[PDB]
Design a protein around this ligand. Sequence first.
Ligand SMILES: CC(C)C[C@H](NP(=O)(O)CNC(=O)OCc1ccccc1)C(=O)NCCCCN
Ligand SMILES: [Ca+2]
Ligand SMILES: [Ca+2]
Ligand SMILES: [Ca+2]
Ligand SMILES: [Ca+2]
Ligand SMILES: [Zn+2]
Length: 316
Amino acid sequence: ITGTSTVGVGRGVLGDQKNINTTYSTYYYLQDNTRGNGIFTYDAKYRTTLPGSLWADADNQFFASYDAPAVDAHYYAGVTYDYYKNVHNRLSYDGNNAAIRSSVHYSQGYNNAFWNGSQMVYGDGDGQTFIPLSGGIDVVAHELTHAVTDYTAGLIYQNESGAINEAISDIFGTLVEFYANKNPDWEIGEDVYTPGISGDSLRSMSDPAKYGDPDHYSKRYTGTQDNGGVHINSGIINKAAYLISQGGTHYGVSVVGIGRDKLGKIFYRALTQYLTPTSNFSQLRAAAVQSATDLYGSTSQEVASVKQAFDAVGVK
Ligand SMILES: CC(C)C[C@H](NP(=O)(O)CNC(=O)OCc1ccccc1)C(=O)NCCCCN
Ligand SMILES: [Ca+2]
Ligand SMILES: [Ca+2]
Ligand SMILES: [Ca+2]
Ligand SMILES: [Ca+2]
Ligand SMILES: [Zn+2]
């Protein structure tokens, strides 16, 4: 909408107060004009019609319980935009500052979030498995990263290419969580998962097997559920990424860690310069080796550690 940029204040899903960029024209709208061609947050009103209504508020204060998922979807989209711009010199998901749109309050009891080809969408959860999913900064960044992938490598959402697609979203979701630096970890979705159980998460990158996901190519799933296990076999690549950053010895193979920033540079370059819609795990290894070679040199520790990490997870 046309209006003037304003700054509202509200409370997110976890009860924390934050400022949000809004736009005033009769109402205050969740429209942040400070980033690219805008970040826009919509109310889906418990229905499945998208996007719903651009979020309108009478007084620029967002402390109602119903407001909390919108506050966080809007704010964390801003953090994710900032990460891509400041760290990778990428302007929004398409590289040309496309408007970023999210809808909250999607459906009833909806234990998921997704990119629908055009926008982000967040359920409220059923209160048992999830609380409103925009409360997780790693979740928000996971979803926006699907848009980045779709505009760049274009990894098809099935089988190995789809597991790479998933892992890319978990990797950058985690790197955005570290960027914001509030309780960062290598777990996925812990802030919105199972409010009655402490210490768990949807997936672990540091130890995928904690939740039954494979941590070695020999343990990959090859059935048809979950688009050929895209959220399962992602564990193999998540483990490799964790090892590249943090190091460790895994199935007897020792990996020298090189840290998160270099992990992110290597995988961002792989995603945007080398991967294709049909890349498999072996082709990802080659892309990551080439990316590290471009950035750090063929004889570098970074290249050697990429090779060790993929060796550790059984990917040649
Ligand atoms: C980070 C997690 C909290 C959320 C994360 N969701 P996602 O983005 O991977 C789901 N996208 C998805 O299907 O895209 C395909 C698609 C394409 C066009 C249109 C629509 C859908 C996820 O791990 N879900 C699995 C666990 C959900 C437990 N009930
Ligand atoms: Ca209000
Ligand atoms: Ca965390
Ligand atoms: Ca996390
Ligand atoms: Ca929990
Ligand atoms: Zn995903």
